[PDB]
Amino acid sequence: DVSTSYLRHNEINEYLQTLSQKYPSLVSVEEAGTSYEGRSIKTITINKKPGNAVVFLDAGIHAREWIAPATALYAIEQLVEHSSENQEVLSNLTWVIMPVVNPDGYEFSHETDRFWRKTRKPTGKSCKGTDGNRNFDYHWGEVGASTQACADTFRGETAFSEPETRAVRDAVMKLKGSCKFYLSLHSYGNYILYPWGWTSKLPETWEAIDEVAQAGAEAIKQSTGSRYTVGSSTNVLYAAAGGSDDWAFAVAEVPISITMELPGGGNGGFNPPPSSIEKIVNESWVGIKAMALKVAQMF
Template sequence: MRLLVVLLSVLLVVSGRPDPRPNLHGAQVLRVVPDASWQLHYLMALQMQGHYDFWTEPRAVGKPVDIMGTAFQLPALHAALTQLDLTPTVLISNVADLLAKSTPRNTEANRQMNWDDYQEYDVIQEWLESLASEYPSVCRVEDIGTSYEGRTLKLLTIGTGAEDNPGIFIDGGIHAREWISPATVTYMINQLVTNSEMYSELLSTINFYIMPSINPDGYAYTWSDDRLWRKTRSETDSSLGCKGADPNRNWGFHWNEVGASSNPCSDIYAGPSPFSEVEMQLVRDEISKRASTLKAYLTFHSYSQLWMYPWGWTSDLPDDWKDLDDLAQTAVDALTAVHGTQYEIGSSTNTIYAAAGGSDDWAKGVAGVKYSYTIELRDTGLFGFLLPPSLIIPTGEETFEGVKEVGYFIARTYGK
């Protein structure tokens, strides 16, 4: 029976997932829970091939895995899962309908930054410039380079003290379809800058270095062509009709050792080499410039409601894991106190899955940033990547409370 399943999987995955926008009419998200290691390993192998869109990755026996199948794919996906003795449940019955409900209402005539809706990349960039112009004593913005397709990446620095004050580096949007990430990061920027008097002691003691969307080409593509696109948009292997690499498998620390794919059509393709993606080179360089003063690195993703620390490439823990865990507990307690949202805490490998080449591992393992975290924002699967705009502000409110705790801790511990 298992041989039959393996043969079926080969037939399913040989073509990979092509670049053109998938037809989401009739698409569903199925959830399965592997209860044996061989089932888990099969799901991992299936993900590596890149045929199906895994909304959550196979991480451990007993942990749910969410997989989207198009109407064309669903019969074969159901058959494969059933033969694996996995009973799929329908998590999202109509992806196209949910997508329509979460589509931004903004028009060209209404391009003002707000958090009642999601915002395009250009709107976010223009807003960063306007903040620096309106609040020059609190923040400044600089262009740090251009993406593969020529979009400008900007870094916003928030702080009123010395340039060598301890710093916190924050980024979002590394995976293009995770729209709640840039929305949450910009919400927190707005709180810090427009209420700077309220946070005067914090901002005079530490510097925040923030990039809301570090995969601009992928993010733009989710607006123009494929809302569920994850990767960058570089020409990695045009012969297969597949573009881009997973930017969070592309960092040069234990690159491509585990939890990544060498298949250019896979959503977890590590790229042809470490830091092959120009956007990740630019972010790496900005972190490296400030490595001597950076005390925390926060990178925001979705979804699953997790606050994680290294390592992602091994189940072993950093020597100072207890320090990281203690601060994470404090941050999550503050987050949960706002709306009651529950987060799981732990190292990446032990909390979700092993995946090498992530930015948080590199920040700690190479740049030496002690408090390095990956935060997976709302939700736990009801909406997945298609979180309604009505949940932007609640997500921002609670996350900001957690980030403030990190900020105050860094100020108390390392402030001059």
Template sequence: MFRITLLFILSLVALSLANQDDYTGYKVYKIVPKNEDELKTIQTLIKHPQVDVWTSSKLIGHPTVFMVPPTLENQLKSLLRVNNMPYDTLIEDVQRTIINEKNEQAEARRIFDDRSGRISFKQYERFDTISGYLRNLTNLHPNLVKLVNIGKSYEGRDLEVLKISSGGNGNKPAIFVDGGIHAREWISPATVLYIINRLVENYSQNSALTDNIDWYILPVINPDGYEYTHTKFRLWRKTRSPNGLSCVGTDANRNFDFHWKEIGASSDPCDETFAGLKAFSEKETAALSNFALSIKKNVKLYLTFHSYGQYILYPWGWTSALPNDVDELDALGRKANAVSGYKYTVGSSTNVLYAAAGGSDDWFKGVAGVNLSYTIELPGGGSAGFDLPPSRIEEVVQDTYKMVKVFASYIDKKFVNNK
């Protein structure tokens, strides 16, 4: 039987990583559970308000990676020692890792900076550059793309969806793609931008994916948080709207109005998984949902990109029960995984990863009626997982695009060629 020490329980104080800007002395650990008891110990451990979970799983043999402050180091090691659980220290000092990543990004920008309005995929782009790129595409390819403003973020940044369509009077099946809902997951917007790049700038080679299908693509749902990770706090996860007396931000992927805050979400405004003061409290999630509902009759597939962990997840996140069409969801996920050079785990969110209500994938399926709805947790890299080096961006986005083509071909076959 697993044991949780009294010392560890007493340390559950109302502190948070949410406003942390200096991670000196913070460490990152990895634990790979060997049995059910160790899984239970880990599930208790990661509920601590000062434990920042970077990737986790409910499966034996799959790693959980988390960051802890110096004040918890002794308690954590005591807990693991009592339960005879081995662990690896992945990062001895998180602040040093952040500084190293900043230097790598600066060097990549120095070498590959392009003022022509293009994207190089040799560096992580800032939000203004991303917006400029989308506008540039509308000028260069006016018959193929259209930029749709669906609202503004809390800090006033434009939320813009790029519609890619080669015609069809709006009657074609559509795919909705988004990224950047969690601010620190930089490889997510980069991946979504690569999908745009292939479909638009390489149209002649990828026309089979756009002739019969319309695409709606939002590269960065959470631009305020994304910019904050570039300018202030690298590991920021949430939005930037005020939500209490002292804390800022809501976990946008707990804010959707489908079984909102039922499980796997926090009521504490300082918590990383704070669900918001109400469902759709965030301008970003409200704008996304309103736009999605306006086009829902055509959308047949939803793909949202996160990092990291290498999972292809389908609903539900609010319950361990499986959707009625689980066989189709699972088979398509595994078919996409088969073309990837990485090994992804395929399954329902709750049963493979953890329960988390209020996510966008559940909402798209449960409310917008998009039956084929997936969250793709991309590969991590570097020493922190979130700090995939700029030199590996192309490797990951190119591999992911192989999977996207499988998803798109399935939609073409099911909703066009089978008619």
């Protein structure tokens, strides 16, 4: 079970490598890029078949949001190690999952500072790190992103200044029009949100995304009774430019683009105790599977 403890980055990549060896007909593991400090940013591709719609799922762009990589890892475990229980999202759907976008920051939050958020790439003489979810090149730097190098929402020296966000960009762009569902896992707050992050004006196809997002919230409510708030980002969060969901929607042209804020726990919300991981990732997968199924029915 990957849902009993928070895994370090090397354990995550070792788990992926094991899956690539154990399931060579179902799974391929590849390097999408290399972090600033030299760590391998890997994806796992599940059920690759010509003509399939692709779900791209990433997590761990923000270092301290530990329940998101755990949820991504649990999703991988269900789809790969329990595929017979998940055929409804494995017929015409291919999954590409990036369980940790920001391994340098993630490891730093384990070793030194539990509440670290950014990358670790130096930004000048005084501080290190960029907010990866303010670093994507769509209306970059226009609102809700700090210009201060040491702020936790620092937008970066330029758009896509971080190899970690370039890795997300390259991995998504490699799908060459086949990606129909982009899903980014964060914490915390129990929200299922969609573009625009940077403005309150609704996108023209917001209803299609809302249909998917409501399906995830509904499935979660029917499974555990937990409530999720669904809507366009600015309904819940103050406007911010440079998020990955905005970029996937507008630049990668992914019709369904969603950011999920996973349940909080522990004294900080970001740090549910390890004993609570299983129930959170189990419930989260219920919503994620239901959104993918809706996408599978639409494409």
